[PDB]
């Protein structure tokens, strides 16, 4: 399982609080396909996060809920609902929500799949195609036009490497052990030429994408860059 | 200054046979906004096929092109058209349609790119978008819906690696130089602290992920899996 951090505390809370503005949207949708993808998103999300059963109370409660609510009286309506069925496990902490909350989302998701790989076959591949559809259909919620359409143009990098694993698992599956590697150069090295996969792999992707998004962000305000995180960093951060 | 070779020629002409197919289905468009968006591309491929108002007289004669025609009439019609615009220079040599027109075409547009940046400029850098929305918008023409849902999943990493060669460009632009490196180790242990940018980065990054689809579908068909290296890729176009 994943090492107890301070920054991995407040991870699982970012994605509760994402969690919960997800399903709130489910009462304004204006489409049905809408709808179901905010049904099945929410639904995935707390299947990472019987619980099942419970979960689908929640999501049910929340296509119901009334539409004329503002946000405030859902997340009281939502807190009742949650402790109800049991689930104050899915009741965020704190509920301001922003940029870092979706990054948490992100970087926690990398890490439960990294965990998923490491402590695992068909049961992980099935994961790992849920994962991309959740990467693939990040929403912001909060207002950044500009952050969706960059988001739109890259987020294959992250979705890529999901592929990468499962393509590694399929040789395992088929007789070739994964090989556990410390860092990216000697995954990436290895490829070219055996089936060796980088420990923490997500982590280190979400990690370097992250700083991509930071860096590319001066192109777009046009301006010159001034702390970039490092793979060591991250690493003494989450205790990985 | 792309290293003219046997398969590079290949690339050209598959990238010739692309573009004329992509203007074919102007005259069919069910939408303003695919109409929109073929003859952006088709212009756009034009503009980096290794004059440009000729071009837009190309383009918008497929555009009012009768839809009733088949296909073989609107290559009679398009062979014509060429000639008399002074752009024999677009016309294929080969009309066999593939996965390979398409992927030569994609490995084509990778090696314009390492090309712009290490003969480079606010120039480069808007080129870059545009490549951005060519790769962005890949149409296969030919049937393979799973290909379009597999590559509509993964085509960001291609899309990431031309922006990290804009990060680049605007580290140069405000004081730090590229420093051009061999392999791709070399520029993403750099990253991670310094200006690094891999040599043919494009033709090696579309090179992965063409070895990524063709592995990935054997996961797709379900079924027990010859890959191009990087050295035998580099070998067969001169890098
Ligand atoms: C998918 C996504 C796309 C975005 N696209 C854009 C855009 O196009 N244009 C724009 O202006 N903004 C964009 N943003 C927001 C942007 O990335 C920053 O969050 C914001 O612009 C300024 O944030 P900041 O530097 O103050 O903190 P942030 O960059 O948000 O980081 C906050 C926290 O995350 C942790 N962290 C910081 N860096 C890293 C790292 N490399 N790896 C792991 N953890 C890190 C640290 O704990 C830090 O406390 C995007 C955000 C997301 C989640
Ligand atoms: C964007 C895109 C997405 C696709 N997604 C799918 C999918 O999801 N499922 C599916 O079944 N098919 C998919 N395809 C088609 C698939 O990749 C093959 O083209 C097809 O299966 C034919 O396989 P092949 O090995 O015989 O020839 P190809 O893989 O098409 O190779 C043909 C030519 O390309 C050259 N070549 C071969 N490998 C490389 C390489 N790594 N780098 C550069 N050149 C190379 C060689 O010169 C060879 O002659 C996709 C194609 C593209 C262009």
Same mark, same amino acid.
């Given at each position: 399982?994943?090492?107890?951090?301070?920054?991995?505390?407040?991870?699982?809370?970012?994605?509760?609080?994402?969690?919960?503005?997800?399903?709130?949207?489910?009462? /304004?949708?204006?489409?049905?396909?809408?709808?179901?993808?905010?049904?099945?998103?929410?639904?995935?999300?707390?299947?990472?996060?019987?619980?099942?059963?419970?979960?689908?109370?929640?999501?049910?409660?929340?296509?119901?809920?009334?539409?004329?609510?503002?946000?405030?009286?859902?997340?009281?309506?939502?807190?009742?609902?949650?402790?109800?069925?049991?689930?104050?496990?899915?009741?965020? &902490?704190?509920?301001?929500?922003?940029?870092?909350?979706?990054?948490?989302?992100?970087?926690?998701?990398?890490?439960?799949?990294?965990?998923?790989?490491?402590?695992?076959?068909?049961?992980?591949?099935?994961?790992?195609?849920?994962?991309?559809?959740?990467?693939?259909?990040?929403?912001?919620?909060?207002?950044?036009?500009?952050?969706?359409?960059?988001?739109?143009?890259?987020?294959?990098?992250?979705?890529?490497?999901?592929?990468?694993?499962?393509?590694?698992?399929?040789?395992? &599956?088929? =007789?070739?052990?994964?090989?556990?590697?410390?860092?990216?150069?000697?995954?990436?090295? =290895? /490829?070219?030429?055996?089936?060796?996969?980088?420990?923490?792999?997500?982590?280190?992707?979400?990690?370097?994408?992250?700083? /991509?998004?930071?860096?590319?962000?001066?192109?777009?305000?046009?301006?010159?860059?001034?702390?970039?995180?490092?793979? =060591?960093?991250?690493?003494?951060?989450?205790?990985?």
């Amino acid at each position: 399982m994943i090492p107890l951090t301070p920054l991995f505390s407040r991870y699982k809370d970012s994605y509760l609080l994402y969690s919960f503005r997800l399903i709130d949207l489910l009462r /304004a949708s204006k489409s049905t396909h809408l709808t179901k993808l905010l049904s099945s998103q929410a639904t995935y999300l707390y299947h990472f996060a019987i619980q099942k059963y419970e979960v689908q109370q929640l999501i049910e409660w929340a296509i119901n809920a009334s539409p004329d609510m503002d946000l405030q009286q859902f997340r009281i309506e939502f807190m009742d609902k949650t402790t109800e069925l049991n689930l104050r496990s899915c009741q965020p &902490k704190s509920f301001t929500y922003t940029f870092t909350t979706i990054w948490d989302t992100m970087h926690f998701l990398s890490l439960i799949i990294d965990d998923m790989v490491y402590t695992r076959l068909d049961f992980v591949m099935q994961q790992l195609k849920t994962m991309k559809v959740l990467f693939y259909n990040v929403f912001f919620i909060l207002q950044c036009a500009m952050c969706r359409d960059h988001y739109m143009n890259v987020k294959g990098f992250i979705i890529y490497h999901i592929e990468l694993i499962e393509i590694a698992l399929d040789k395992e &599956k088929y =007789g070739t052990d994964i090989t556990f590697v410390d860092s990216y150069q000697q995954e990436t090295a =290895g /490829a070219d030429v055996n089936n060796m996969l980088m420990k923490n792999l997500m982590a280190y992707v979400s990690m370097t994408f992250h700083n /991509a998004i930071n860096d590319y962000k001066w192109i777009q305000r046009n301006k010159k860059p001034y702390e970039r995180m490092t793979w =060591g960093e991250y690493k003494k951060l989450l205790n990985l």
